[PDB]
Amino acid sequence: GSHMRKKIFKPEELRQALMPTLEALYRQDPESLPFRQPVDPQLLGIPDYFDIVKNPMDLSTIKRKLDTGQYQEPWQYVDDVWLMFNNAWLYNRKTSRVYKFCSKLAEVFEQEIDPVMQSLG
């Protein structure tokens, strides 16, 4: 009965592994462009991207909460990152190139973060 206890590392360690994965998602150009900046349906003038997605999220959100240290567990990052891909597949569906761009990013995440969560999670 190997029962692991709440070990976790810290805001700095979580960054040491999560940031790198973030770079693996930002290294892409067309797939990580609108994902690094909010949409602001007001400036955009299109009330809809925020009405169907309770949490728009964006690469600038996780990276920011990480640069400061808002969460102490790694699950908060993997949960926020996937939450970002959730909105994409939740508002873009399969009828848009954004769902495609977000698709490769996700695959590149579960593949880049696999080693991290393996020793971090």
Among 23, 27, 46, 69, binds ligand TTR (CB under 6 A): 46
Contact, 61 vs 84, CB < 8 A?
A: yes
Q: Which stretch binds ligand TTR (CB under 6 A): 23-31, 41-49, 78-86, 103-111?
A: 41-49
Pick between residue 27 and residue 97 the one whose CB is nearest to ligand TTR. 97
Q: Cα separation of 80 and 86, whole Å?
A: 9
90 makes contact with ligand TTR (CB under 6 A)? no
- Which residue's C-beta sits nearest to ligand TTR? 34
Q: Cα separation of 87 and 31, whole Å?
A: 14
